[PDB]
Amino acid sequence: DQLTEEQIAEFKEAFSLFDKDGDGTITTKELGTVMRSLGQNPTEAELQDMINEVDADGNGTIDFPEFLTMMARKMKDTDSEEEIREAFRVFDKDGNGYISAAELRHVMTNLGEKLTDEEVDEMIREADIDGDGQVNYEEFVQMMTA
Amino acid sequence: DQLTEEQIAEFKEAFSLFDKDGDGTITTKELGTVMRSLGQNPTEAELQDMINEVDADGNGTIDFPEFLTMMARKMKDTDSEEEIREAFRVFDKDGNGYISAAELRHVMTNLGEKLTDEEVDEMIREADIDGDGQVNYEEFVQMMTA
Amino acid sequence: GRKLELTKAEDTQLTKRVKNAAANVLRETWLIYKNTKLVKKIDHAKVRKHQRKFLQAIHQLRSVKMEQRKLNDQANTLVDLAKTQLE
Amino acid sequence: GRKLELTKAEDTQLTKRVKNAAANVLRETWLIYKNTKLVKKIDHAKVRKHQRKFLQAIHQLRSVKMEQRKLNDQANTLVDLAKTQLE
Ligand SMILES: NC(=O)Nc1ccccc1
Ligand SMILES: NC(=O)Nc1ccccc1
Ligand SMILES: [Ca+2]
Ligand SMILES: [Ca+2]
Ligand SMILES: [Ca+2]
Ligand SMILES: [Ca+2]
């Protein structure tokens, strides 16, 4: 719960991601728009709870100082290795710790935002450590999070 | 996933808790009414998901055989000691493992559905093992779940 | 930089739901115990009644707990987004 | 009888959310790794971009997981209610 100077400035930039009309205040409406752009669907009550948690003076909106104060409370991060492994596991059809290079290309070129076949080339080159056309995704994720 | 005879009959009784109009079929509307009577608030999509999970033939409602089949899958129970302890902990203001007899009476005669002062008498008689006017709620819950 | 790391995890409306539901867990835990262990003669209709009330209260507390986990991750989404500006 | 015990725990809409979000976790994990470890010259605007997409995908999967836990406990509420008739 103590922030540096550069971080205070960087978080002013961050405030503009939320303060969509730039009026110096973040409202439930602006948080709804932002959360939906991130593919989530908070209810009105959830938006209100998210404002209220950091709404120090109770005027119904979050100011930069309320926003900054709050970030100081939550600076701690943790590694994402297991969550990332679990995302790969979604595509492990046989539950055997492997996804084939062919199946990985198929996933990456069809689902989500997608990679180009050239970008997939590079990914598989790194992922297929043994050159056996199979991705041990636990090992690949360990490599990327090291 | 194998049910006895008495249980099949008991679960026919259970089906009527859900089949509110008795027409032999449980609908999303009936599950909404029931879930709300239990103090929950499932969305339409959640109600539909709960029907669909056990809707073997896809006609949109659950029959007794779909209902029975399903129960067979979920007969396993587990003890509730820790959850019960955590409910008592809600009233442990100082986080010290104790709730006074006075505070317990206050809670039980004012919050939730409530107990009569006479029913609270009986509860405290059991709960206050040491006769010190204090309830070690971990010990009390262990006694009740033994 | 932060690379692939994310914010580490772990109201009045919810607070009222918690106190009422928790009080009811205490209530029905006690009444089930009484009616199954401190009586000469178990009345099963009584036990069934308090079992229904017990499961409703336990599942109400679960519901609150799940909503708090949800709220916490919604907040952490926003904090994570803010932290991209640290890069 | 069952006394204070309860059912032990642990869709197509959710299934599509999972496959798309998971694919995006893979996508942005890779692109962040590439842009922070396999380049001569780190482009921070690129890293920031993929960090935003990475956190959105990770938090989308969390959201699905939380909803499945919620659905599971809603079903278990109904099974628990049904089991009161076993008393
Ligand atoms: N609770 C919480 O974190 N709220 C929030 C976060 C970022 C911006 C605005 C509001
Ligand atoms: N998923 C699930 O358990 N659904 C359900 C449970 C009881 C009655 C009717 C439907
Ligand atoms: Ca604004
Ligand atoms: Ca405020
Ligand atoms: Ca009906
Ligand atoms: Ca059906």
* Residue ranges of domains in chain C: 1-87
| CA angle in degrees (0–180, nearest 5) for B38-B25-B16 | 50
For residues B86 and A66, give the distance between their C-alpha atoms in angstroms, rounded to a whole number.
Answer: 32
A35 in contact with C at a CB cutoff of 8 Å?
Answer: yes
For residues B86 and B79, give the distance between their C-alpha atoms in angstroms, rounded to a whole number.
Answer: 13
**Counts for chain C of helices (H) and strands (E), in that order:** 2, 1
The answer to whether residues A41 and A88 belong to one domain is no
CA of A69, nearest ligand number: 1
Query: Last residue of some domain: B50, B79, B108?
Result: B79
How would you label A16-38 residue by residue, b for 16+ Cβ within 10 Å and e otherwise? Answer: ebbbeeeeebbbbebbbebbeeb
Characterize the bridge pairing of strands C6-7 and D6-7: unpaired
For residues C20 and C64, give the distance between their C-alpha atoms in angstroms, rounded to a whole number.
Answer: 11
| CA angle in degrees (0–180, nearest 5) for B24-B27-B29 | 130
**To the nearest whole angstrom, how far is the Cα of B40 from the nearest Cα of chain C?**
7
Q: Please give the single-letter amino acid code of residue D39.
A: V
For residues D54 and C5, give the distance between their C-alpha atoms in angstroms, rounded to a whole number.
Answer: 10
Chain-chain contact of B107 with C30 (C-beta, under 8 angstroms): no
The answer to whether residues A35 and A90 belong to one domain is no
For residues B64 and B54, give the distance between their C-alpha atoms in angstroms, rounded to a whole number.
Answer: 11
CA distances (Å), B40 to each of A109, C26, D47, in order?
41, 19, 43
The answer to whether residues A36 and A87 belong to one domain is no
Long-range contacts of A86-92, Cβ-Cβ distance < 8 Å, separation of 24 or more: A86/D61, A87/D21, A87/D22, A87/D25, A87/D26, A87/D29, A87/D57, A87/D58, A87/D61, A88/A135, A88/A137, A88/A140, A88/A141, A88/D22, A88/D26, A89/A137, A90/D18, A90/D19, A90/D22, A91/D22, A91/D23, A91/D26, A92/A137
Q: How many CB pairs under 8 A join C and D?
A: 73
Neighboring chains of C (3 or more beta-carbon pairs < 8 A): A, B, D
CATH number of D1-87: 1.10.287.70
How would you label B17-46 residue by residue, b for 16+ Cβ within 10 Å and e otherwise? Answer: bbbeeeeebbbbebbbebbeebbbebeeeb
| Coil vs helix vs strand at D7 | strand
Characterize the bridge pairing of strands B77-78 and D6-7: antiparallel
The answer to whether residues B37 and B96 belong to one domain is no
What residue owns the CA closest to ligand 1's atom 1? A50
Is the minimum distance from the CB of D78 to ligand 2 under 6 angstroms? yes
A126: CB partners within 8 A, 6+ apart: A140, A143, D30, D33, D38
C68 in contact with A at a CB cutoff of 8 Å?
Answer: no
At A99, which helix (H) or strand (E)? strand A98-100
Provide the greatest CA pair distance for chain B.
Answer: 61
Domain count, chain B: 2
For residues B48 and B45, give the distance between their C-alpha atoms in angstroms, rounded to a whole number.
Answer: 5
| Coil vs helix vs strand at C53 | helix
C38 backbone φψ class: left, alpha, beta (φ>0; ψ -120 to 50):
alpha
The answer to whether residues B93 and B75 belong to one domain is no
Is the minimum distance from the CB of B62 to ligand 2 under 6 angstroms? yes
Task: Name the residue range of residue B69's domain.
Answer: 1-79
The answer to whether residues B74 and B88 belong to one domain is no
C65: CB partners within 8 A, 6+ apart: none
For residues D65 and D47, give the distance between their C-alpha atoms in angstroms, rounded to a whole number.
Answer: 27
Contact (Cβ atoms closer than 8 angstroms) between residue A48 and residue A28: yes
User: Which of B84, A84, A133 lies closest to C27, judged by CA?
Assistant: B84
For residues C35 and C49, give the distance between their C-alpha atoms in angstroms, rounded to a whole number.
Answer: 11
Chain-chain contact of B76 with D4 (C-beta, under 8 angstroms): no
For residues A65 and A56, give the distance between their C-alpha atoms in angstroms, rounded to a whole number.
Answer: 9
B144 in contact with D at a CB cutoff of 8 Å?
Answer: yes
For residues D66 and D79, give the distance between their C-alpha atoms in angstroms, rounded to a whole number.
Answer: 20
Instruction: Tokens for D55, please give them.
Output: 């956190």
Among chain C residues, CA nearest to B119: C31
- Only one residue has tokens 């005027």, namely A59
The answer to whether residues A56 and A98 belong to one domain is no
The answer to whether residues B73 and B96 belong to one domain is no
Interruption sites in chain D after residues (C→N beyond 2.5 Å): 10
A64 CA to middle of ligand 4, Å? 9
C1 in contact with A at a CB cutoff of 8 Å?
Answer: no
Nearest to C77 among D29, D33, D55 (CB): D55
Question: In Å, how far from its chain's centre is CA C1?
Answer: 37
CA distances (Å), B125 to each of A47, B55, B113, in order?
45, 49, 20
CA of B65, nearest ligand number: 6
Chain-chain contact of C55 with D85 (C-beta, under 8 angstroms): no
Contact (Cβ atoms closer than 8 angstroms) between residue A50 and residue C75: yes
C59 in contact with B at a CB cutoff of 8 Å?
Answer: yes
Instruction: Tokens for A53, please give them.
Output: 């948690």
Query: Last residue of some domain: A79, A94, A113?
Result: A79
Instruction: Tokens for D3, please give them.
Output: 């006394």
Instruction: Tokens for C42, please give them.
Output: 């178990």
Long-range contacts of B12-15, Cβ-Cβ distance < 8 Å, separation of 24 or more: B12/B64, B13/D85, B14/B67, B14/B71, B14/D81, B14/D82, B14/D83, B14/D84, B14/D85, B15/B64, B15/B67, B15/D82
A34 in contact with C at a CB cutoff of 8 Å?
Answer: yes
Among chain A residues, CA nearest to D18: A90
The answer to whether residues B27 and B66 belong to one domain is yes
Is the minimum distance from the CB of C71 to ligand 1 under 6 angstroms? no
Contacts of D83 in chain B (CB under 8 A): 14, 77
Is the minimum distance from the CB of A50 to ligand 1 under 6 angstroms? yes
Compute, in degrees rounded to 10, the torsion defined by CA atoms A37, A40, A41, A45: -100
At residue A19, φ and ψ (nearest 5 deg) are -75, 75
For residues A65 and A84, give the distance between their C-alpha atoms in angstroms, rounded to a whole number.
Answer: 34
Instruction: Tokens for D78, please give them.
Output: 């109904």
Query: Can you list the alpha helix ranges (DSSP code H) found in chain A?
Result: 5-18, 28-37, 44-54, 64-73, 81-89, 101-108, 117-127, 137-145
What residue owns the CA closest to ligand 2's atom 3? D75
Query: Last residue of some domain: B33, B63, B79?
Result: B79
Contacts of A103 in chain D (CB under 8 A): none
Q: Please give the single-letter amino acid code of residue D76.
A: N
D66: number of Cβ within 10 Å: 15
- Indicate the angle between helix axes A44-54 and A28-37, nearest 10 degrees: 110
**To the nearest whole angstrom, how far is the Cα of A127 from the nearest Cα of chain D?**
9
A54: CB partners within 8 A, 6+ apart: A62, A66, A67, A69, A70
The answer to whether residues A29 and A92 belong to one domain is no
* B78 beta partners: D6
Which A residues, 75 through 134, put their C-beta within 8 Å of a C-beta on chain D?
80, 83-84, 86-88, 90-91, 104, 107-108, 111-115, 119, 122-123, 126
At residue A87, φ and ψ (nearest 5 deg) are -65, -45
User: Which of D37, D26, D87, D35 lies closest to D60, judged by CA?
Assistant: D26
B114 backbone φψ class: left, alpha, beta (φ>0; ψ -120 to 50):
left
First to last CA, chain D: 6
The answer to whether residues B6 and B73 belong to one domain is yes
